Structure formats: C-alpha cells, structure tokens
Design a protein around this ligand. Structure first.
Ligand code: GTP
Ligand code: MG
Lengths: 415, 180, 18, 137
C-alpha cells in the first residue's frame, strides 16, 4: 500500500517521484536524507525508514535509493516486490542504472511508472509484455496482459526453434577458522533463453529423487533438492500433483527453476593457509590450495581472495602456479588462476613488510573467498532427462543446455 | 632486460650500504660519529632525540643513524629496525654498574625476529682510562660468542685519539661486501 | 565453444518411463 | 554399431570376472547427448545381447548390472535408469518398455538368486507397467 514511489540520488535529490495514493505530503522527502544520515551514523540505519506517521521503506539501487513513502499498515513485502519488479523493468529497458538515464529517459519513465502501479497496487510487471505498450521511440494493449498467459506473447515467430539452457551451480561453503565447514549450501539455477515460434508448453523432465522414488527408480543418481522454486510460467498445481513441470517458456532469457539443497560432500578446493605475522616486523602467508574436485574438470578463472594486512607494504610473493596480485583498493591478495586442473595443488609463501607503529583501531578478520568457476561440472549429480516442447502448429525443437559450476558463498573464515 | 648501466656504475663504484648507531648515553656515540664524519672531538649536549649522518669511504656511503641511550628512548630503537641493513653497538666499559644494563639492552635488541641480517658490530668506547678492559674480557662478559647466526666483531677505539677506526671500517666493509 | 561448459542438447521426455 | 560390438566382449568379460554376490565428481562428455533409453533402442540392445550372448543365463548381480549400465551410457549416452527390474519375489520384469531382458529365479527377494533371461514378449506386453501402474504414472 505504497503512497508515493520516488527515486532519490546520492546527494539526496529526488530524481523522480510518482505519487500513488497522495496521503503523504511531497515535502516529507526532505527529512528522509537527515533521517538516513542519523540512522547510519548511529548504527540504526535500515531500508525501512519512518518520518513520524509516514514510513519510508526503500532499497538502495546502483546509483539511487528507491524510497517509497507509506502511511497505513501496508505490506512491506509487497512494497519490496514492487521495487524489485520496477528495478528489473528498468534494467530490461535501460542497460545501466545511473543518474544519466533518469534525467534522459523521463518521458518513458513517467509513462512506465503510471502504467505499472495505480493507487499503490501494481498490475503489470513483465518487461517483455510492457515493451509492447510503452516505448521511448501507442496502440491498444496486448491481449497477453488481459489473458491468463501474461509471460508469453502470442504470435511470436522465428526462423529456427533453439532454446539454450544454463544449469548454473553456486557452491557456497562456510568454513570456520577451526577448519570445519559450517554452512555448505548449493543452490541450483536453471536459466533458459527460450527462442521459439508460437507459444510452446515446455515439459521439463529431470532425474529428481522424489520423481525417481514415485516412479520406482529410486536407485540411480538423483538430485535431492531441498527447495525447488519454479518460475511464474511453471504451474504450481502440476508440480504439486505428480512433480510435473509443465509451463510455457517466455521469449528470451528467464529463470524457470532454482533448486536449493544442502551439500554433504567434501569441498572441491581445500585451502591450507598459514599466517606467520611477526609483531610489527614481517608476515608469512603459507597458503596451500588443494583441488578436491574431479581431475577431468578444470576451474576456469580461479580467484582465491586472500585478505592481506591493511597496512602491509613492500610485499613479495613466492607462489607455485597462478598470478598473485595485491590490490590496494581491496587490501587483499588476489590468487588469480586462469586454469586449474582438477586435483591440482598450488602452494604460496607470502612475505610483506609492516610499519613499526601499530594501528590505532582494529580492522577485523575478513574471510578468504575463492572465485573458482569450473564449467561442465555437476557436483549435485542432477542431469536433465527430457524437455517436452509441444506446439499446436507442430515443429521440431532443438533444445540446448549447459552446466556451469562456479563458487558462490565460498568464503573461508580466517584464524 | 639490460644491466649495462648497472655494470657501468659498478665499474667505478655503486654500492653505498648503511649503518646504525646505538648504545647507552654518554658512551661516545656522538663523539665517534663526529670523528668519523668530520674528524674532531665535538662536545655536545646529551642526545634527546637522534643524529643522522653519512660517511663516504671506499666508495661506499655509510649512513649512520645515532640513537641515544635514554630510558624513555630505549624502547624507541624498534623504529629504526625497519629498512635497516647495519648495526653498530658501542659499549661503555667505564660504567661497571651500567655494563649489565647495556648487556641486557643488547640482548633485548638482539631478540627481534626482524633484525636478523644485521651483523654484530661491537665498538670498545672510552679506550682512554686504565680501568677499561681488553677486547676479550668485555666480549666474554657479554657472551658475544653465544650469538648463533650472528657475526660479531670487537674493536677498541679511543675517542680522544681515533685509533682503530680504520680497522673497524675495513672489517665492516669486508663483512658487508663479499667481492674483490 | 563457450566458457562454462559447451551447450548440450536435451531430450524430450523420459523414454524409459513410457 | 562397431563401438557397441567392440564394447560387448569387454563388457561381458568384466561382468563374468565380477562375482555374482575412488574418483569424485560427475564429469560429462562435452556435446555428448544425454537422454533416457527409448523402447526401440532398448529392443535393439536386447536383440544384440541375445545374438552375441553372455547376457542370457548370466547370474544377476548389482555390480554386473551397474557395469553394464555404465558401459551402455558411455557408448550411447543413455541414462542408467531404464535398466530397472520389478520387485520380487519371483520373476522381475524390466521397468522400461521394450527391454527383452528379465530376471527369473535360478534355485526374501533380496537373497533369491536371479539370472538374466531373454523374453521377446517384454517388448510387446508391458508386464512391469501392468504389475505397477502407479510406478508408470
Ligand atoms: N674526555 C673524554 N670523554 C669521553 C671519551 N669517550 C667518551 N667520553 C664521554 O662520553 C660522552 C659522549 O657524548 P657524545 O659523544 O656527545 O654523545 P653520546 O655518546 O651518544 O652520549 P649521549 O649524547 O648522552 O647519548 C662525552 O660527553 C664524554 O664525557 C673520551 O675518550 N675522552
Ligand atoms: Mg650522542
């Protein structure tokens, strides 16, 4: 129940505002900046502000914070969802999120803001569907918005029917300073770029553990996803009945399904790091990285971020394989490796200077983060079984899919 | 890469080196530095801070950073341990009660893991009174031979005369430079 | 080719499950 | 299929070597298609196995079945899930329609000795589907 959706800037200037209910005066935006400054300066800064009886709940974008004032007991989750939808629409329409487009795309921005939400209740949020009614360079609205299928425009025709899938893996590992892993969660991500003719009804099929158990084949390699979240095109009833994933893919790249389950396997990379930091004299970085992943897989662009001392200067690196660079902006040792064969072992010996004068305040212990991205590797063992592309006209589809394994929340706690 | 310029510089002398000046107050450190730099016995007030000078000899610029022996300045020697290549210790044989304090200070300064490549340089200061010991009794009392992985050299210099400075400089040059 | 694993064609359905 | 013919003797020898009773990761061949085995493909494989021999009358074992499924997947790209048998006790029919191979007793269904027996009626009659309609959906 947002009262007015407004967009501010880094200097507190409201780039664009769009009142929805009008129950809040437009002059309350002035106190938002001082309130945010006070909250941040006292540790009480939160995305949901409160100017007396009016609450300013908003998130920070790339260049401006989309703060939306509200007065009643509106759904904060609904406001956040509307803000996320607006951000996604802006990203789809504008390739960049900065002040250069707010002052240059106001003609289309105002129309999009007016059409998206009326009286604080949004009605349309599909960028592809909205692109047929609001353009910056107007006919009747398409029947897709009025029809049930609001994510697949009818009448789309293409020379070929090629759909590219992306089985993106996110390896998140939370290794404590004692050497044990606390949080090891792997979240699957099946992103497909559907480009076909008509309105095909995709019928995705995989070797799911639940599906295998229901069919009676619960003995082969099946992915046991704790959480499986289908997209808007995925029918909830079909998945709830017999694990049937039947939905109409949209025109373009979109997120269809996102598996999420815990992982009980050993880490694909084992990092043995040592810190021989002398008292204001010198420091040693005996970092050894062992690849526990399969030897047939190569981790392209391995980036093991090693947090070095903040005041360290005049450093020397004694490594084995991979480029090691210290970035003063980041204040860490970037263990950059181009290609890492599975089972490889990289040993490094850090040596950097330290000032005699001690630091005035503590800086903490940032965790060591690895940025390994090994494609063509499926740690979870989930493999796509079938993809039923059915069209009324009748055509031979050529679906495609790729499996990419990368490091997600793969942070290692320091000692 | 090309090192022709480095070879040309080394053909006529390029190495300079560094040096340190530490020790107790009234140990002849300022007078020794003045004699090494100028060549005269200059009388100065006690070194509240420190003195920095350079000595040009044998085509090597021996920069010396004098450090006082004040109680409030004893723990301040760690500031000069960074980017330090040499270290010279001046003993005070005329203070029997201060000999133990000087030995303790030298042991504490030698117990640093950053100052490990600095070889020992013991200078027998105040070599003008009959009460001064020899070049071995002081070393035996201080146990300089028990410094593992440390190259110590005991040299006796007279502040009033200046004898033995050339021998100490030659020994320091031989220890630092390992060429012809 | 493409970084992150070469694209592979997918099946139509579980042929072994009828 | 020259590759299938070549792999049949080695697969049979490996199955015979294994008695009837180390690397981590799941590497995938780049560009190799992966899909469930089809009824026609299963029938052709059963006919080839019957003609070549080594599968009919062989003692059924979990290790031998796993090795055969892995070899079939490597040589054809078929997932090792269509080589399933109906639960015992007694004769177990193939789970995938079109398969001509079945397990029959040779003497708890787990301790019962089973051997692979050719059955041409499997490719035409869905015995496994009729026995377990719920499993077939
Ligand atoms: N007359 C005489 N006095 C000496 C001799 N050697 C050392 N001293 C005494 O040692 C002191 C040396 O002081 P400086 O050379 O100016 O500096 P320093 O050795 O670092 O002593 P502080 O300034 O107190 O740290 C002099 O004041 C002398 O009293 C010597 O050979 N003859
Ligand atoms: Mg002095």
């Amino acid at each position: 129940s947002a009262s007015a959706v407004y967009v501010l800037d880094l200097k507190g200037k409201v780039l664009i505002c769009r009142n929805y209910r009008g129950d809040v005066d437009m002059s309350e935006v002035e106190h938002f900046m001082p309130i945010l400054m006070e909250k941040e300066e006292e540790g009480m800064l939160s995305p949901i502000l409160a100017h007396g009886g009016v609450r300013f709940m908003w998130i920070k974008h790339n260049n401006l914070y989309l703060v939306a004032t509200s007065k009643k007991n509106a759904c904060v989750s609904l406001v956040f969802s509307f803000l996320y939808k607006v951000v996604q629409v802006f990203s789809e329409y504008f390739k960049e999120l900065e002040e250069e487009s707010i002052r240059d795309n106001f003609v289309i921005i105002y129309e999009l803001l007016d059409e998206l939400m009326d009286f604080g209740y949004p009605q349309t949020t599909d960028s592809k569907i909205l692109q047929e009614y609001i353009t910056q360079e107007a006919p009747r609205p398409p029947a897709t918005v009025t029809n049930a299928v609001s994510w697949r425009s009818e009448g789309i025709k293409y020379r070929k029917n090629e759909v590219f899938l992306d089985v993106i893996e996110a390896v998140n590992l939370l290794v404590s300073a004692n050497g044990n892993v606390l949080r090891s969660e792997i979240v699957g991500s099946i992103k497909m770029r559907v480009f076909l003719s008509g309105m095909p009804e995709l019928r995705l099929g995989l070797n799911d553990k639940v599906l295998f158990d229901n069919t009676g084949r619960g003995k082969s390699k099946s992915v046991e996803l704790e959480d499986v979240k289908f997209h808007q095109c995925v029918r909830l009833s079909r998945f709830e009945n017999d694990r049937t994933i039947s939905f109409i893919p949209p025109d373009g790249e979109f997120e269809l399904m996102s598996y999420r389950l815990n992982t009980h396997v050993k880490p694909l990379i084992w990092i043995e790091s040592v810190i021989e930091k002398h008292s204001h004299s010198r420091i040693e970085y005996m970092v050894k990285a062992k690849s526990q992943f399969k030897r047939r897989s190569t981790a392209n662009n391995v980036e093991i971020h090693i947090p070095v001392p903040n005041d360290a200067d005049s450093p020397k690196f004694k490594t084995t394989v991979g480029s090691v660079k210290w970035v003063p902006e980041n204040s860490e040792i970037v263990w950059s490796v181009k290609s890492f064969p599975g089972g490889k072992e990289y040993l490094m010996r850090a040596h950097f200077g330290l000032p005699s004068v001690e630091a005035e305040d503590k800086e903490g212990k940032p965790p060591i983060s690895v940025k390994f991205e090994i494609p063509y590797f499926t740690t979870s063992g989930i493999q796509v079984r079938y993809l039923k592309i059915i069209e009324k006209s009748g055509y031979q589809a050529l679906p495609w899919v790729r499996y990419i394994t990368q490091n997600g929340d793969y942070q290692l706690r320091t000692q | 890469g090309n090192i022709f310029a480095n070879l040309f510089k080394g053909l006529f002398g390029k190495k300079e080196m560094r040096i340190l000046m530490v020790g107790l107050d009234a140990a002849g450190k300022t007078t020794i530095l003045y004699k090494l730099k100028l060549g005269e016995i200059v009388t100065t007030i006690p070194t509240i801070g420190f003195n920095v000078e350079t000595v040009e000899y044998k085509n090597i610029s021996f920069t010396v950073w004098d450090v006082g022996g004040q109680d409030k300045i004893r723990p301040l020697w760690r500031h000069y341990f960074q980017n330090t290549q040499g270290l010279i210790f001046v003993v005070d044989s005329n203070d029997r009660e201060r000999v133990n304090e000087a030995r303790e200070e030298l042991m504490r300064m030698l117990a640093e893991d950053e100052l490990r490549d600095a070889v020992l340089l013991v200078f027998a200061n105040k070599q003008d009174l009959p009460n001064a010991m020899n070049a071995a009794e002081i070393t035996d009392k201080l146990g300089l031979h028990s410094l593992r992985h440390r190259n110590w050299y005991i040299q006796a210099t007279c502040a009033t005369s200046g004898d033995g400075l050339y021998e100490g400089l030659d020994w320091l040059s031989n220890q630092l430079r390992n060429q012809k | 080719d493409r970084k992150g694993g070469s694209y592979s064609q997918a099946a139509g359905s579980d042929s072994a499950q009828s | 299929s020259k590759s299938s013919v070549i792999g049949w003797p080695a697969v049979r020898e490996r199955m015979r070597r294994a008695e009837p009773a180390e690397e981590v990761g799941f590497p995938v061949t780049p560009q190799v298609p992966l899909r469930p085995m089809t009824y026609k493909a299963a029938v052709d494989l059963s006919h080839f196995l019957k003609e070549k021999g080594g599968l009919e009358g062989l003692i059924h074992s979990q290790r031998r079945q796993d090795i055969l499924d892995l070899w079939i997947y490597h040589t054809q790209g078929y997932f090792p899930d269509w080589q399933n048998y109906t639960p015992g006790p007694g004769v177990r029919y193939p789970l995938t329609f079109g398969w001509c191979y079945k397990l029959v007793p040779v003497e708890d269904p787990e301790r019962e000795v089973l051997e692979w027996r050719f059955d041409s009626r499997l490719a035409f009659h869905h015995v496994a589907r009729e026995l377990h309609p719920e499993y077939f959906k």
